[PDB]
């Protein structure tokens, strides 16, 4: 028998910090989801997921109006995950 890590190559991206609300527009949808889609569309070609998620977090930097701060959690990615869209 051979040994393998029980938990590896995970990344979680949540819409807000622990204890805190995430916002959803009744007609335009969830802000975190919309922001994530836009950044994935733009940066999947050139950035790994960790970088993209960081960029998403940056977009929420200014606590204007309905503030929230997306969080990356339980990261065991050992390599960069590039999506190579088109490949």
């Amino acid at each position: 028998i051979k040994k393998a890590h029980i938990e590896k190559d995970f990344i979680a991206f949540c819409s807000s910090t622990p204890d805190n609300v995430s916002w959803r527009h009744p007609t335009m949808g969830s802000v975190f989801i919309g922001r994530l889609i836009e950044h994935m569309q733009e940066y999947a070609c050139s950035c790994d997921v960790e970088e993209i998620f960081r960029k998403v977090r940056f977009s929420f930097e200014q606590p204007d109006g309905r503030a929230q701060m997306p969080t990356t959690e339980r990261v065991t990615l050992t390599r960069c995950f590039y999506l190579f869209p088109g490949h």
């Binding site: 393998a4 890590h5 029980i6 938990e7 590896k8 190559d9 995970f10 990344i11 979680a12 991206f13 949540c14 819409s15 807000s16 910090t17 622990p18 204890d19 805190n20 609300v21 995430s22 959803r24 527009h25 009744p26 007609t27 335009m28 949808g29 969830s30 975190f32 989801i33 919309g34 994530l36 889609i37 994935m40 569309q41 733009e42 940066y43 999947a44 070609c45 050139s46 790994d48 997921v49 606590p63 503030a67 929230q68 701060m69 959690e73 339980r74 990615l77 390599r79 960069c80 995950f81 590039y82 999506l83 190579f84 869209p85 088109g86 490949h87």
Partner: protein
């Protein structure tokens, strides 16, 4: 809808610290979206259809076969996640995406039956467990991306300051 990575762009990125991507014509990428919109004791999540649409289109355009499940209890979510982890396509896949969208509290993600009196909660810990090397050996060494749209509690998440 996704800006493409050119052949020279991919060559610029490619060395030994990148997740390997399988051949386009032979790979079977899978993704799962679980979205709760209608609840027994919590107001309807109007706009969730916009979220499902966008995430489905994006993940499909990134090469994933997307399955969509709606209005489930934590137990149903557990059963679905267990079935997803057992899918043979993962063996000929290089990665996966798991998308959860629902009401949420500190403890985790709300199932459709959730109440303050009778909790119906899927814990983040359980999601990781069901997708780990023991319970999902087919995704060993492969990136597993978990996306969660939900509150993590009812606090506005701010502090006030004068100066």
């Amino acid at each position: 809808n996704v800006k493409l990575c050119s052949l020279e762009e991919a060559q610029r990125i490619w060395s030994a610290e990148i997740y390997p991507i399988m051949d386009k014509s032979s790979r079977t990428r899978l993704a799962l979206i679980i979205c709760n919109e209608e609840f027994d004791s919590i107001p309807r999540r109007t706009g969730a259809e916009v979220d499902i649409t966008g995430m489905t289109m994006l993940l499909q355009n990134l090469g994933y076969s997307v399955d969509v499940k709606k209005n489930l209890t934590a137990s149903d979510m557990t059963t679905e996640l267990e079935a997803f982890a057992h899918r043979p396509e993962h063996k000929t896949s290089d990665s996966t995406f798991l998308v959860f969208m629902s009401h949420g509290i500190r403890e985790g993600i709300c199932g459709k039956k959730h109440s303050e009196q009778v909790p119906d909660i899927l814990q983040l810990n359980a999601i990781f467990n069901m997708l780990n090397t023991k319970n999902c050996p087919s995704l060993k060494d492969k990136p597993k991306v978990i996306i969660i749209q939900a509150c993590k509690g009812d606090s506005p998440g701010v502090v006030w300051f004068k100066d």
